[PDB]
């Protein structure tokens, strides 16, 4: 039966792992961000003595790098940072193409479109904003926006239509359609602020979570509240699987991998159980991302490590 083994663990950071992402073009790369103010591009050897080595280290920020995302070609890479700026990397030696100037506060969330021509940003400005790849502002959203910090935005894969998700700490999830830039809907739910949201690879769903730590499911186009599940104390990051209908929820002491059909927990990932006391005996898990193979998944922790796992039958 499909179950999990502890694969290995990476090392090479002085700051807490904030995000991880992986391009399906090169699954032999993997990319990471951290509060050591650098994004590290790795070189994955599949030896079990290690599991990878840092290839290069991209440098140049004056505050944390919150979120990071790959290009659809894997030849570019983009970052959002708490210095209020973004950078557009050339992931071959270094040498930033462009830095995006204009925010008054942190840039928390960021995402990179499928056509590689639209780039969004969530900010503690309380503004979602759109960005040309030339590094200028196609649009700015300041009407019908969140009344609190913007937690996470997403581009939605679709048949062709433009839809983007937005969720803030005002305990609401707003869906936006481009070329009118209007509220498609407002979804109400979750007591306490929202941390994260993520969209299905098919794109008709929004799995949302927050302080509540409950996983509520919404319909993108039907606009209906499907159901709610108790996901534990707090869920900081979510990521669907590419080759299954699972959903992997990142809670503090454990990662909870959920089968969706039927609705049940498959397993709970436990890491090293080393004796420590008392407030967070293991480090909290904060980010996670699947590989495109779907065999292996990765995790971000606050001990500066990325723990690897692998599915075993």
């Amino acid at each position: 039966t499909e179950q999990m083994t502890l694969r290995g663990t990476l090392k090479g950071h002085n700051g807490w792992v904030t995000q991880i992402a992986t391009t399906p073009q090169f699954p032999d790369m993997i990319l990471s961000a951290s509060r050591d103010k650098t994004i590290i591009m790795w070189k994955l050897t599949r030896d079990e003595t290690n599991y990878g080595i840092p290839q290069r280290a991209l440098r140049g920020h004056s505050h944390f790098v919150s979120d990071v995302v790959i290009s659809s070609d894997g030849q570019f890479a983009l970052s959002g940072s708490w210095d209020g700026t973004l950078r557009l990397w050339d992931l071959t030696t270094g040498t930033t193409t462009r830095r995006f100037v204009g925010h008054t506060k942190d840039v928390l969330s960021v995402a990179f479109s499928s056509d590689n021509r639209q780039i969004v940003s969530g900010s503690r400005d309380k503004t979602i904003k759109l960005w040309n790849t030339l590094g200028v502002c196609k649009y700015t959203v300041q009407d019908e926006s969140h009344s609190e910090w913007v937690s996470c935005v997403r581009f939605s894969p679709n048949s062709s239509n433009p839809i983007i998700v937005s969720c803030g700490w005002d305990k609401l999830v707003k869906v936006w359609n481009l070329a009118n830039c209007k509220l498609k809907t407002n979804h109400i739910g979750h007591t306490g602020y929202l941390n994260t949201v993520t969209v299905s690879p098919d794109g008709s769903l929004c799995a949302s979570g927050g302080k509540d730590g409950q996983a509520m499911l919404w319909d993108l186009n039907e606009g209906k509240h499907l159901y709610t599940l108790d996901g534990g104390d707090i869920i900081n990051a979510l990521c669907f699987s590419p080759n299954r209908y699972w959903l992997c929820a990142a809670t503090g002491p454990s990662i909870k991998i959920w089968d969706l059909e039927g609705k049940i927990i498959v397993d709970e990932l436990k890491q090293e159980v080393i004796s420590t006391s008392s407030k967070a005996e293991p480090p909290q898990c904060t980010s996670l991302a699947w590989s495109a193979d779907g065999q292996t998944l990765f995790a971000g922790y606050t001990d500066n490590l990325v723990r690897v796992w692998q599915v075993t039958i």
């Binding site: 809907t185 407002n186 979804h187 739910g189 979750h190 509520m216 209906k224």
Partner: protein, 65 residues
């Protein structure tokens, strides 16, 4: 704060027997706003200016716009 939030004056006044010294020291009150003249923070104990809001009535629903 002594440079901002107080003004001080000295004036000598004569009489038929010697001199008398007058001194007046007065403390400026503005902290909410305006002119703006003296700066908005409080001088001696620098206070934390604290607004308040706190409500929730949320329940799950979908409301289409």
């Amino acid at each position: 704060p002594v440079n901002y939030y107080v003004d001080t004056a000295v004036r000598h006044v004569l009489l038929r027997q010697g001199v008398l010294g007058i001194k007046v020291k007065i403390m400026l009150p503005w902290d909410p706003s305006g002119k703006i003249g003296p700066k908005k923070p409080l001088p001696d104990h620098v206070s934390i200016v604290e607004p308040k809001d706190e409500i929730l009535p949320t329940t799950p629903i979908s409301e289409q716009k």
